[PDB]
Amino acid sequence: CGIWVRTSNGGHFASPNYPDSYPPNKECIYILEAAPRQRIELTFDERYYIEPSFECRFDHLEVRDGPFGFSPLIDRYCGMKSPALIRSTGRFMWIKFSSDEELEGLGFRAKYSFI
Amino acid sequence: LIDSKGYGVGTPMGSPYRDKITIAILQLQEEGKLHMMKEKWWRGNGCPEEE
Amino acid sequence: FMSSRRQSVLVKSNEEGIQRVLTSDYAFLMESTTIEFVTQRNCNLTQIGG
Amino acid sequence: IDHKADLAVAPLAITYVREKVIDFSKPFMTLGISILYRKPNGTNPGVFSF
Ligand SMILES: *[C@@H]1O[C@H](CO)[C@@H](O[C@@H]2O[C@H](CO)[C@@H](O[C@@H]3O[C@H](CO)[C@@H](O)[C@H](O)[C@@H]3O)[C@H](O)[C@H]2NC(C)=O)[C@H](O)[C@H]1NC(C)=O
Ligand SMILES: *[C@@H]1O[C@H](CO)[C@@H](O)[C@H](O)[C@H]1NC(C)=O
């Protein structure tokens, strides 16, 4: 799953097998690293725009500012809605995508940018 | 050694600073800046004369 | 004592729990049966206590 | 506690008794305690030790 996107002013970040449904049982990490004094602007492109009536687990895309499982939780995104664009100067937006044992969806498309 | 205590920073109840000073704390650490700040202040250089 | 240490000495694998005793002074409270597979098939190690 | 001040960056170990009523950041460094003692002279006259 690893697409090492280190040292880019901007670049493509996306779920595996993006135009297809993402594979099951996948717990793969992604890490965004910014040089000192920079700002991270994460652009996220949803594939499908619908309004869910519920929020659930089993497939969750959370965002962290710092090392994983050890930095404060920013938010934990799921469903088919496009999350709002996240602007922080924590300089380390490290993002993990999970997978349950079934029930794949349309995946996601994102774009990281550095200033 | 006897106990493994931890040096943190005091902060009041529910203050928004903890959740965002720690990310600074971690940022200062992971890049090594703490080690040099550690080094630059514990650079006492009197050696242990060998016994 | 272990909680005082709290991974100062709390070892995660049996086989490399052996070498902590091979290389220094250690206790490594471990189950009876695996002892017999090691102490009988390795030297320098003894069943201690009951 | 009285909010008359703010985050107090100072040597203060993250202890439970403080933690119960104090909010605390992640440790910027660890801490330990140990014996601190002078180097013993350890000298016996020896001219009339016998
Ligand atoms: C009339 O049209 C509206 C859409 O304009 C229908 O709205 C849907 O209503 C349900 C509740 O009956 C919503 O579920 C709820 O969503 C809120 C916000 O997420 C949540 O806090 C509640 O716990 C509950 O899950 C649903 O989101 C909402 N939108 C959708 C998906 O259509 C409404 O049902 C229609 N009227 C009827 C009675 O058919
Ligand atoms: C006991 O320790 C010595 C020194 O490491 C080693 O050479 C020897 O192989 C050990 N005992 C046996 C017979 O396994």
Swiss-Prot record, chain A:
It comes from the Eukaryota. Brain (at protein level). Disulfide bonds join C1-C28, C56-C78. It is found in: Membrane. N-glycosylated. Residues 1-115 form the CUB domain. Accessory subunit of neuronal kainate-sensitive glutamate receptors, GRIK2 and GRIK3. Increases kainate-receptor channel activity, slowing the decay kinetics of the receptors, without affecting their expression at the cell surface, and increasing the open probability of the receptor channels. Modulates the agonist sensitivity of kainate receptors. Slows the decay of kainate receptor-mediated excitatory postsynaptic currents (EPSCs), thus directly influencing synaptic transmission. Interacts with GRIK2 and GRIK3, but neither with AMPA-nor with NMDA-sensitive glutamate receptors. This is Neuropilin and tolloid-like protein 2. The lineage of its organism: Eukaryota, Metazoa, Chordata, Craniata, Vertebrata. The gene is Neto2.
Swiss-Prot record, chain C:
L-glutamate binds at E31. Belongs to the glutamate-gated ion channel (TC 1.A.10.1) family. GRIK2 subfamily. It comes from the Eukaryota. Sumoylation mediates kainate receptor-mediated endocytosis and regulates synaptic transmission. Sumoylation is enhanced by PIAS3 and desumoylated by SENP1. Ubiquitinated. Ubiquitination regulates the GRIK2 levels at the synapse by leading kainate receptor degradation through proteasome. Homotetramer and heterotetramer with GRIK5. Tetramers may be formed by the dimerization of dimers. Assembles into a kainate-gated homomeric channel that does not bind AMPA. Can form functional heteromeric receptors with GRIK4 and GRIK5. Can form functional heteromeric receptors with GRIK3. Interacts with DLG4. Interacts with NETO2. Interacts (via C-terminus) with KLHL17 (via kelch repeats); the interaction targets GRIK2 for degradation via ubiquitin-proteasome pathway. It is found in: Cell membrane; Postsynaptic cell membrane. The chain holds residues 708 to 757 of 908 of the full protein. This is Glutamate receptor ionotropic, kainate 2. Ionotropic glutamate receptor that functions as a cation-permeable ligand-gated ion channel, gated by L-glutamate and the glutamatergic agonist kainic acid. L-glutamate acts as an excitatory neurotransmitter at many synapses in the central nervous system. Binding of the excitatory neurotransmitter L-glutamate induces a conformation change, leading to the opening of the cation channel, and thereby converts the chemical signal to an electrical impulse. The receptor then desensitizes rapidly and enters a transient inactive state, characterized by the presence of bound agonist. Glycans are attached at N44. The postsynaptic actions of Glu are mediated by a variety of receptors that are named according to their selective agonists. This receptor binds domoate > kainate > quisqualate > glutamate. It does not bind AMPA without coexpression with GRIK5. Highest expression is found in the olfactory lobe, piriform cortex, dentate gyrus, hippocampus, granular cell layer of the cerebellum, and in caudate-putamen.
